[PDB]
């Protein structure tokens, strides 16, 4: 478990520094303009809270999953938009001035909608209630290591736009070093993950959920005829999820032996999400080159 605590601390520092780097690409005026007249934000919220949990429900019903496995899929589905989308949307020149709005409003709306969707969906899968085990002190606390670095980044750019360099290179160097450290800390647990006989249905579900998220986001954006960058921004916000709540919910609700192999599910979700995001990024950059 000390490895888990070290991973959490290194990941918190990772988020802090990467968002300090990322906060240089937006301005407060554009944030205000995009927050007003909520067109893109409404579509992103409707997507993330009506088509990703419904996809979780239908996919769990159709793949013939257990009660606990279906519960894990549902909890990952209902989770708020992750902070991975902020980093990813830069890789295809998405409207970064709107991805922050999406992430913040998604977290705030999750704080009060996750129990509602969980109660509406887990009927027949869970005997008790899930409106009591959702960590409300973590949803609103995960938002701080995102807003604080971004806010100091925009303040640095707007007030003193001469320290643009130097800090960027130092942040990239420390990010690379801590990423190598996390790789070392994770390769020792991937072995136990593969030793555990995770059912191939769950691997298929974790690989196929983000793909459906991305494609349904793109289709939804195309239906309402959004812009160019905003289309990719919504189509990749609606697919990235914060699966660090699934582990907490499962640990609180069920004994450590009932979840079993599902304790490694968030790592699998992250690795498949990274793989699919990077594949899409490479495809889009190749498209832009031609």
């Amino acid at each position, epitope marked *: 478990r000390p490895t888990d605590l070290a991973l959490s601390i290194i990941l918190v520092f990772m988020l802090f520094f990467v968002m300090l780097s990322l906060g240089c690409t937006m301005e407060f005026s554009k944030i205000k303009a995009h927050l007003w007249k909520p067109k893109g934000l409404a579509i992103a919220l409707v997507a993330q809270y009506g088509i990703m949990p419904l996809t979780a429900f239908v996919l769990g019903k159709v793949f013939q999953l257990n009660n606990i496995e279906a519960l894990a899929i549902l909890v990952c589905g209902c989770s708020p938009g992750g902070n991975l989308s902020n980093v990813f949307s830069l890789a295809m020149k998405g409207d970064m001035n709107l991805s922050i709005v999406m992430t913040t409003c998604s977290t705030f709306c999750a704080l009060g909608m996750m129990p509602l969707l969980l109660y509406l969906y887990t009927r027949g899968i869970y*005997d008790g209630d899930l409106k009591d085990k959702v960590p409300y002190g973590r949803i609103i606390l995960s938002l701080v290591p995102v807003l604080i670095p971004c806010t100091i980044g925009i303040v640095l750019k707007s007030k003193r736009p001469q320290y643009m360099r130097y800090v960027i290179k130092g942040g990239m160097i420390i990010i690379l070093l801590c990423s190598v450290a996390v790789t070392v800390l994770s390769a020792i647990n991937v072995g136990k993950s593969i030793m*555990f006989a995770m059912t191939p249905l769950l691997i298929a579900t974790s690989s196929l959920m983000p793909f459906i998220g991305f494609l349904l986001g793109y289709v939804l954006s195309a239906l309402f005829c959004l812009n160019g960058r905003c289309r990719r921004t919504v189509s990749m916000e609606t697919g990235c999820q914060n699966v660090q709540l699934c582990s907490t919910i499962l640990n609180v609700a*069920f*004994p*450590p032996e009932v979840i*079993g192999p599902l304790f490694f599910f968030p790592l699998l979700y992250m690795i498949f999400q990274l793989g699919e995001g990077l594949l899409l990024i490479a495809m889009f950059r190749c498209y832009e080159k031609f």
Partner: antibody
Amino acid sequence: EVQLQQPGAELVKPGASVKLSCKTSGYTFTNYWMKWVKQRPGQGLEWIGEINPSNGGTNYNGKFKSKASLTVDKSSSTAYMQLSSLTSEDSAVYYCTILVYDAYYVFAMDYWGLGTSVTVSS
Amino acid sequence: DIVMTQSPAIMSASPGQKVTITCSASSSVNYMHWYQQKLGSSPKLWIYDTSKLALGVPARFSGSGSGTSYSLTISSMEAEDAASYFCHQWSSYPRTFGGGTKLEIKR
């Protein structure tokens, strides 16, 4: 050493209520779930319910939801049960179990109580 | 709920011959765990996740199978193994134990 202490036997009257205690010592009481198992002589084991001492959340069996009420008291480390409105077919042996389980280094180990032989006298 | 049809209910065996106990679930179960209860004692975990061994169980025991048919195999039976074995699953609530087989010793 881990030890779970249970009363040897309890005597009741039909239609009455009884409280079963499972005093645990030698380990921190608020980490492992406490599972209650009922064994009727002549049948297999039946699972009754769980309870997380540090949180209070419980999961019951389908047919024991209206007969069992698991409760804990972390100050005394004592996990309780309250069978209600006993019948002639409730005469059995009730065990309290904790299961150690982890995935970092895979291993498991059970710690069972001695069983509280509950019978209906009349 | 998943019911278990564990057969045979009563088994006769010899100290040195291989014996097998089959637990036949009535629905798809991922993992099946076996409990051993001796004479006048609380059952203790014996084999969990259908192939692994608990702490203290001798290495002779072994479980196999997947789907809705799990088996427990003893390579070389000894006189200390005469007890009752229950198959137990916790992957789909409520947890349901099997009917149990009474393993004896022949002479």
